[PDB]
From a paper:
Here we show how myeloperoxidase (MPO), a highly expressed neutrophil protein, disassembles nucleosomes, thereby facilitating NET formation, yet also binds stably to NETs extracellularly. We describe how the oligomeric status of MPO governs both outcomes. MPO dimers interact with nucleosomal DNA using one protomer and concurrently dock into the nucleosome acidic patch with the other protomer. On the other hand, MPO monomers stably interact with the nucleosome acidic patch without making concomitant DNA contacts, explaining how monomeric MPO binds to and licences NETs to confer hypohalous acid production in the extracellular space.
Numbering used by the authors:
A (entry chain G): 11 to 117
B (entry chain C): 13 to 118
C (entry chain D), D (entry chain H): 28 to 121
E (entry chain F), F (entry chain B): 23 to 101
G (entry chain E), H (entry chain A): 39 to 133
Write the structure that this text describes.
Amino acid sequence: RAKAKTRSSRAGLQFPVGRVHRLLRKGNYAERVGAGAPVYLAAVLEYLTAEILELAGNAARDNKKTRIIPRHLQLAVRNDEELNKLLGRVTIAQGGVLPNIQSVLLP
Amino acid sequence: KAKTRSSRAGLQFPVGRVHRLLRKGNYAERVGAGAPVYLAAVLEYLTAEILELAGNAARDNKKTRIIPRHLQLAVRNDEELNKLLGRVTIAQGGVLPNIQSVLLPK
Amino acid sequence: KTRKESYAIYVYKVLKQVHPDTGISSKAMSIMNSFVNDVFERIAGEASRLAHYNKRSTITSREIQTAVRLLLPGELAKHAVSEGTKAVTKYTSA
Amino acid sequence: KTRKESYAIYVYKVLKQVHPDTGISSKAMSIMNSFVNDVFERIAGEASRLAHYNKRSTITSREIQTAVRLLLPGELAKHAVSEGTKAVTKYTSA
Amino acid sequence: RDNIQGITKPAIRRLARRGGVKRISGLIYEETRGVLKVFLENVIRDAVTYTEHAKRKTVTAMDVVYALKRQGRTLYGFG
Amino acid sequence: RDNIQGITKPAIRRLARRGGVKRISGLIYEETRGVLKVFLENVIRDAVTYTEHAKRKTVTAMDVVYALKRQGRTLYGFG
Amino acid sequence: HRYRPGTVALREIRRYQKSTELLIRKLPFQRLVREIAQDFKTDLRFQSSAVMALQEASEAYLVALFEDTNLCAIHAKRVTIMPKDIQLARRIRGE
Amino acid sequence: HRYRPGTVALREIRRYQKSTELLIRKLPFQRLVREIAQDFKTDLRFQSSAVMALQEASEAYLVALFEDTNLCAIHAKRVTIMPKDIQLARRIRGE
């Protein structure tokens, strides 16, 4: 028998493949499952996660900090039009609100 | 002699069809023996409840048959049924009559 | 051609009981036929979800009862639950 | 005790790949895990419904592609689709 | 190709009277037409995608009902 | 056993000064106190039903999350 | 013999709130729907019921929006509706 | 040396719009929740984490409602809020 090669290495990805396949099969979503669906799903999920994390990390540098806290996540999510449209009815714990005042109450 | 399961439970709605639809709709992997009877009874009760009010409303207009306007009138005029079906549009239904008191002439 | 199945005689049978001197039209029949599927799908989906939640693989009477109690608001829940329990008991008696 | 699975290592690897020097806390990990789970559930459910609607019982790449095009709004979706295709091609290569 | 002008003026007045109004200004029509176009674009796109997937050339009302349910304006009386 | 009086006036004032209000009238507090109870009851009833169905005598933090999810307000962070 | 302003509007409201029909004409709506659909794809053929379904949904949506706009207008001590009310009503619900 | 009505309110708004703390107290809210839950069952035993989630959800809902009612109030040429605005916002939203 030859040496085992992980299926994630063949497709050049980072997210797992077998776990997604098993979860899809065991969740009784359909009677049968093909072959390329786990690969497609893993690629899409990896792309979305990378985009969101990159935006959050870029936003978190302004406060002269190093780590990431949910305030930075909220600030990065609410400042992008498409991401705001996607997460339209989601609440994040300890998020706060964007600074915004009306134009009539000002002196 | 074969006897239908609907006759045993004293219900006018079918029992086998509901069981087959539940089994073949991949909702779960096993289905209990007594499951379909509850659903059949609930559906029959809801249908009778709607139809009684529909016919009572239709009787007013000195008519015999039922048209969707009567169904809309019966559904909208009730409280709980409005909450249940406050998220659905009925074709050829009309609008409940109402005029604001401010706009009236005086 | 091909067979298509729909609830078209059970509704008429029910109507012939509450009011014995009233007919129905085609469009009202279509509306009533389309009304049942929504409730059926909602209840079945809620029951499947609740059954999956507790790390179990079975659907029985208790899940349907809980879904009915959760979904129907107001006062219809009591009467519906009572009727379902009575029907289940009568069938079990045989 | 029992073993519970999560999505921590992969998220950390992606973060290290994108930004070389940047830490993270526990709350961000929990939020990322919940978001990934929610998105996966939504996409899989939509794909299953669409696959069922056409009187066929199989989930393949076409259903996933159509579900992705239906769910994700705007330019984002475009990019995602392209990415997916490339991955499949590599699997075909080897 | 200015088919958007086929809606014409009195139809908006009839719709407003059905809804219930007593006085209408002179700039409502443009906003109404814009809103209607915006809604129709999204609904038509969502309907077209389904029939594109199924490898067919004729659009049926079933797909329109499905799109309206997915976005959510559940409609009764069309199967 | 009157506990609705726990929410006091300065707490309402602090909670209000996050949308941008500048002047506060004298009858807002009673309306807010009346409003809060309906939402609390609506969430708590479903949470208790979910807990009861599983044959347990305690409320997990998870049941509240799936109680909030049904209405249409998701909550990321607790699972 | 003339009618003071206001009476005919009330008469029209009473007449039109007690009937069910289709208000907008059919052919211009069909042409507009065909053009909008053709904007996305070429060689598209339509059936006979999708147009009716789209018309019904559009009518219901417009009626609901107009009712909400009228309520928002009567809120602010006025009788005439203006585009600001429509914009605010659309904004509040979320669109 | 006294200020004038309008400045400290703006200062408070600026200070409070830049934090992620918790405003309402803990013990009264916990007692209120544990008393409200008494009407459906008996001798219930809460965990140590559900109360925080309920508090967060309630705070977010109240903040959103107050923002919407402020917008509805400023619509009508005013800088004050009265229960009419809250009622109108609740009616228009769909509740």
